From Swiss-Prot, chain A:
Protein name according to UniProt: DNA-directed RNA polymerase subunit beta'
Known role: DNA-dependent RNA polymerase catalyzes the transcription of DNA into RNA using the four ribonucleoside triphosphates as substrates.
Gene designation: rpoC
Source superkingdom: Bacteria
Family: Belongs to the RNA polymerase beta' chain family.
Assembly and interaction partners: The RNAP catalytic core consists of 2 alpha, 1 beta, 1 beta' and 1 omega subunit. When a sigma factor is associated with the core the holoenzyme is formed, which can initiate transcription.
Species for this entry: Streptomyces coelicolor (strain ATCC BAA-471 / A3(2) / M145)
Curated annotation (Swiss-Prot), chain B:
Function: DNA-dependent RNA polymerase catalyzes the transcription of DNA into RNA using the four ribonucleoside triphosphates as substrates.
Protein's UniProt keywords contain Transferase: yes
Chief localization: cytoplasm
Complete-protein stretch covered: 4 to 233 of 340
Designated name of the protein: DNA-directed RNA polymerase subunit alpha
Location(s) in or outside the cell: Cytoplasm, Nucleoid
UniProtKB/Swiss-Prot annotation, chain D:
Quaternary structure and partners: The RNAP catalytic core consists of 2 alpha, 1 beta, 1 beta' and 1 omega subunit. When a sigma factor is associated with the core the holoenzyme is formed, which can initiate transcription. The RNAP complex including the principal sigma factor HrdB also interacts with RNA-binding protein RbpA.
Protein name per its UniProtKB record: DNA-directed RNA polymerase subunit beta
Residues in the signal sequence: none
Family stated for the protein in its record: Belongs to the RNA polymerase beta chain family.
Its job: DNA-dependent RNA polymerase catalyzes the transcription of DNA into RNA using the four ribonucleoside triphosphates as substrates.
Domain of life assignment: Bacteria
From Swiss-Prot, chain E:
Function noted in UniProt: DNA-dependent RNA polymerase catalyzes the transcription of DNA into RNA using the four ribonucleoside triphosphates as substrates.
Record field: catalytic activity: RNA(n) + a ribonucleoside 5'-triphosphate = RNA(n+1) + diphosphate
Cellular-component GO terms for this entry: cytoplasm; DNA-directed RNA polymerase complex; nucleoid
Subcellular location: Cytoplasm, Nucleoid
Gene Ontology terms, MF aspect: DNA binding; DNA-directed RNA polymerase activity; protein dimerization activity
Span list, region Alpha N-terminal domain (alpha-NTD): 1-225
Entry protein name: DNA-directed RNA polymerase subunit alpha
EC number: 2.7.7.6
Annotated domain remarks: The N-terminal domain is essential for RNAP assembly and basal transcription, whereas the C-terminal domain is involved in interaction with transcriptional regulators and with upstream promoter elements.
GO biological process: one example: DNA-templated transcription
Length: 48, 230, 240, 435, 226
């Protein structure tokens, strides 16, 4: 099941979004990689 | 788990990539940095160490007949790769007359000593040639700094040139994660190295492995233990 | 934030950073890294390096090309420059065509670089450039030696005399005010001016205080995070 | 150290120092202030002896004491009981069965309290560095030590209050007889329809078996004729069973059963009432929010082995690592001093007559000689100063003959667990209290 | 140039804290090897420990054994940190029984044949006058560390409590690098690798296992080329 999930997360843009979308560059797409844990992980130069 | 192994990827005849298979967590660092430093400062070889440019003084900047200045002579000669089977300081000669340019193909080798880059361009000359100097090949390992070797003291003509006995020239070691049966935190080692034309990197792997295996057998010999591996 | 701090440490100068191996000349990147590993080449040390065919040299240094009769056709000839190892290690991240960079690449400069790569080079190359910049920045951020201990936060030595003089002015003002020949509004505005001047003077004193390599100085000057006001708050005076 | 922050950070710390889950091995901080004892005693959950005398027994649950007046009192203790949100109020003993007690002495401790002092978090060793960017922008990276020691782990108690109603289609019963279910799902269930008191529960289980005796499910004339032709009477009952929520694990802490037969108070219709409490233990994990006492907030980024994180000169690793870029900008330079004093406490110092001004002051205070572990108390606005902290770090007890470990200026020659070489320059390390 | 091959020794200062010295080492070459040794010593030297408890009369670890001062969870968290030494591959069932007022010290635990407990100085619990205490301890070998949850394997025995395990017979492992005074211009250096172990193995055998693992690893790396 997790193997197929790692397979399916590939080639699937995912729309990350935050609450107060003040400007246009507030909702974007990303490619998901199946990290362990219980939190979503983000690139360190889209946090602006 | 599964027994790891090694794979090599060829890109050119001077640099190559090595991959050490998915490793147990943390041990990627047990391998990488030690492999880097052992490849760097363990394997020996032959190199220049001191030369005698004829008819010059340290207070004199350039040299007549050759527009090339002293510093770039050092920079051009220290790149001369050389192998030896002598193990003591030899002294060998290099001369040239007439206009043109002196390259790496007109140096009269002594017994046993061989140079592996005959196409190296050394200097350019115009008019009267009068080029002659003697260079000293030594054997050693690592990278020796330009310390005053007390050769200038007894003779003005002596000048010491630093060298790189090490076949390896540049090294890059990294660790990256991979999935092995729903286990992703496992590590995996990458080592990409550029080694000069003296010998292929795989022989450097052999020699570094010999050194490391010896230096850890020196600790394994304390006893015989039932640890469990392979 | 920190990536720019890493790049700034990589591409800074040797101004008071304990140079090691100055005046020497090297032949390539290999010798530079060997001298770095052996522990005789400071990362930010003024050294003369030869670069091979492929590198596009700086701009201002070209008209000072090598004085020789033959045509020094610059765009594919190996050359020699009085560089620093940091710039040499920074240049290979930027693509094979970007002209050499020989200035402290802080906050805005990195933005100038990205603007140029965005308008000239395609998007994927800019992505690779940003990723490599990130890797180098984090690497040298780990191995920078910037860590907020309690010795980093400086105290301007002259701030004490600054505030003592300005409170001398304040107590003269108050000794007059209790006499009544001045009003409360006048005293309040005069104090506003007095302590605004005190705040500015302590700000410039803190500017003078730090060394270039002090971590907080590296944050403010590299445009990593914060401003001058927040360092005034931390180390100098918080302001009215 | 509340005088070394900004108004917003003290406000944030005040707000976010009051949503801390309790911990199993609750312990007082190494560095704190004298409003843990008072704030844990004047509260309620700590059991106290209001009678001077001598204890007879301190058993599992009932502490039995005999007074000077000569009366027997059975102090019952709140052993693994539930609170409003679903945490645990577990009480524990502090004394033995041969001890004298005076009035108003803490004969036990409540949750998040040790020895009658408030215990919210734990003490962990910190090293201030940017490290691979895993702490980029005010985040936190932790060591797997605190997954083995269970230093930072908590226990929660969910509840379920289910009950059957008389309805109109016959009275609902609480029975093991759930229509057409496998024997494994009700294996834990009791004959009356409650799981065994102690067996585990996970998402996808059954808590209480409930069913409505009658039902008008499908009795249209066509289906009535079909059933008559078949000749078999299908079961009109329907499962009204309780259901553990999907996304929770736990183990049962207790069960309670009630019925209209007893004098209990219940509105009408309700037949049988069941209250099943479930109690789970959680260990610290990446993504679980953490914080500190100066609002230095953050979330766990990644968990690494013990050796990956650095180690000092004598081999002891570092427990937590924080990004030193947040300290200046966020404007809270009141945590560095907490870290330094925490280290000073965790390796006891020894100021036996240094003759310095600060030494004389700290001596007339009397807090000069300290063994390795004596928790330190710092007043909120009369806490430890600076030069005293520096001198204390200068004159700590050597590990061996002359091994004063960290340099006299806070920093420490912390090595690099990853590669092995020392980091280019020293690092600042100590001990901090983490909620 | 220099043919002075490395040579190992062994210095002793106390029962277990032992430092082993290698003098003939290349300059700037001891730190990475010391890191290698520390890593393998901190997470690659097997041992044994206790896997689960089975008390009678207590089905879950959130109640208290009748007439027992410490809870069941506290018993778990104070038994999981035992100091033992086992040799059998299959896990062995060790017993403990006590009654009446007496601290149940680890000495009171009964080691079966082939398994030992190396520390009887442990204050597990202090019973009261009506103590009727019984305990079972499963012991198994391994290496590293395991979390409590995955240790559970069987549901047919319901009252048994599964807990975690710590397969690690080792403590702080530091080292140092000194400057050799041999008259060579490279100014050779010297490595001093410290080791400490609690009470299970000895530093000699611990480093023997470490050397065995690292020798296997680097022999693989050395020979598998081609």
């Amino acid at each position: 099941v997790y193997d197929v999930l790692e397979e399916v997360i590939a080639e699937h843009p995912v729309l990350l979004n935050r609450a107060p979308t003040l400007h246009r560059l507030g909702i974007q797409a990303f490619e998901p990689q199946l990290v362990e844990g219980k939190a979503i992980q983000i690139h360190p130069l889209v946090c602006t | 788990a599964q027994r790891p192994s090694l794979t090599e990827e060829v890109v050119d005849e001077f640099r190559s990539r090595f991959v050490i298979e998915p490793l147990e967590p943390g041990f990627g660092y047990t391998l990488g940095n030690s492999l880097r430093r052992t490849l760097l400062s363990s394997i020996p070889g032959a190199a220049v160490t001191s030369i005698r440019i004829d008819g010059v003084l340290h207070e004199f900047t350039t040299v007549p007949g050759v527009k090339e200045d002293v510093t770039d002579l050092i920079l051009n000669i220290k790149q001369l790769v050389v192998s030896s089977e002598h193990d003591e300081p030899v002294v060998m000669y290099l001369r040239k007359q007439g206009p043109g340019l002196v390259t790496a193909a007109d140096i009269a080798p002594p017994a046993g000593v061989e140079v592996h880059n005959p196409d190296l361009v050394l200097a350019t000359l115009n008019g009267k040639g009068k080029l002659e100097m003697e260079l000293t090949v030594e054997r050693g390992r690592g990278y020796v700094s330009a310390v005053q070797n007390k050769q200038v003291g007894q003779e003005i003509g002596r000048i010491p040139v630093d060298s790189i006995y090490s076949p390896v020239l540049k090294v890059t070691y990294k660790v990256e994660a991979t999935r092995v049966e729903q286990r992703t935190d496992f590590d995996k080692l990458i080592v990409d190295v550029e080694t000069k034309q003296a010998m292929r990197p795989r022989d450097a792997m052999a020699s570094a492995g010999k050194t490391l295996v010896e230096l850890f057998g020196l600790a394994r010999e304390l006893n015989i233990d039932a640890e469990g591996i392979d | 934030q920190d990536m720019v701090l890493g790049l700034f440490f990589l591409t800074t100068d040797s101004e008071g950073r304990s140079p090691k191996g100055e005046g020497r000349a090297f032949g390539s990147s290999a010798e530079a890294i060997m001298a770095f590993d052996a522990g005789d080449l400071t990362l930010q040390a003024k050294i003369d390096i030869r670069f091979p065919v492929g590198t596009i040299p700086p701009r201002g240094f070209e008209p000072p090309a090598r004085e020789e009769g033959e045509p020094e056709w610059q765009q594919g000839d190996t050359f020699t420059l009085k560089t620093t190892l940091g710039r040499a290690l920074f240049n290979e991240l930027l693509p094979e065509d970007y002209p050499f960079v020989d200035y402290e690449v802080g906050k805005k400069q990195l933005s100038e670089i990205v603007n140029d790569l965005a308008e000239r080079y395609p998007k994927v190359i800019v992505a690779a450039t940003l990723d490599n910049l990130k890797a180098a920045g984090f690497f040298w951020a780990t191995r920078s030696g910037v860590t907020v201990a309690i010795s980093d936060i400086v105290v301007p030595d002259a701030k004490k005399e600054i505030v003592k003089g300005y409170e001398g002015q304040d107590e003269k003002v108050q000794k007059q005010y209790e006499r009544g020949l001045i009003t409360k509004e006048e005293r309040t505005q005069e104090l506003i001016a007095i302590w605004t001047k005190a705040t500015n003077e302590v700000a410039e004193a803190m500017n003078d205080n730090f060394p270039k390599t002090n971590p907080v100085s590296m944050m403010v000057n590299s445009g990593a995070r914060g401003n001058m006001m927040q360092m005034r708050q931390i180390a100098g005076m918080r302001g009215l | 150290f509340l005088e070394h922050d900004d108004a917003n950070r003290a406000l944030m710390g005040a707000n976010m120092m009051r949503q801390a889950v309790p911990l199993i091995k609750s312990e007082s901080p190494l560095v704190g202030t004298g409003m843990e004892y008072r704030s844990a005693a004047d509260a309620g959950d700590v059991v106290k002896a209001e009678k001077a005398g001598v204890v007879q027994e301190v058993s599992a649950d009932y502490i039995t004491t005999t007074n000077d007046d000569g009366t027997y009192i059975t102090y019952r203790l709140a052993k693994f009981s539930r609170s409003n949100q679903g945490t645990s109020v577990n009480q524990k003993v502090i004394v033995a069965e041969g001890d004298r007690i005076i009035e108003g002495q803490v004969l036990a401790d409540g949750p998040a309290t040790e020895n009658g002092e408030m215990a919210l978090g734990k003490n962990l060793l910190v090293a201030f560095m940017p490290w691979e960017g895993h702490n980029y922008e005010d985040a936190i990276i932790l060591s797997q030590r605190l997954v083995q020691d269970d230093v930072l782990s908590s226990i929660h108690i969910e509840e379920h209050e289910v009950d059957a109603r008389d309805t109109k289609l016959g009275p609902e019963e609480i029975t093991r007889d759930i229509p057409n279910v496998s024997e494994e799902v009700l294996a834990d269930l009791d004959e009356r329809g409650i799981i065994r008191i102690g067996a585990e529960v996970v998402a996808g289980d059954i808590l209480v078996g409930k069913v409505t005796p009658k039902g008008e499910t499908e009795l249209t004339p066509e289906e009535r004729l079909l059933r008559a032709i078949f000749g078999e009477k299908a079961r009109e009952v329907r499962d009204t069973s309780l259901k553990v929520p999907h996304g929770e694990i736990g183990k049962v802490i207790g069960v309670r059963v009630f019925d209209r037969e007893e004098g209990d108070e219940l509105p009408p219709g309700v037949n049988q009432l069941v209250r099943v409490y479930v109690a789970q233990k959680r260990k610290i994990t990446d993504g679980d929010k953490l914080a500190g006492r100066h609002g230095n907030k953050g979330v766990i980024s990644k968990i690494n082995p013990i050796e990956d994180m650095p180690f000092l000169e004598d081999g002891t690793p570092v427990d937590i690592i924080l990004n030193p870029l947040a300290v200046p900008s966020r404007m809270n330079p009141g945590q560095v001093l907490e870290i330094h004093l925490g280290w000073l406490a965790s390796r006891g110092w020894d100021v036996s007559g240094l003759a310095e001004e600060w030494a004389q002051r700290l001596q007339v205070i009397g807090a000069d000689k300290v063994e390795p572990g004596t928790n330190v108390a710092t007043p909120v606005f009369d806490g430890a100063r600076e030069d005293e902290l520096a001198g204390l770090l200068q004159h700590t007890i050597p590990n061996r003959d002359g091994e004063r470990m960290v340099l006299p200026s806070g920093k420490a020659r912390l090595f690099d667990g990853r590669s092995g070489e020392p980091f280019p320059e020293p690092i600042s390390v100590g001990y901090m209290y983490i909620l």
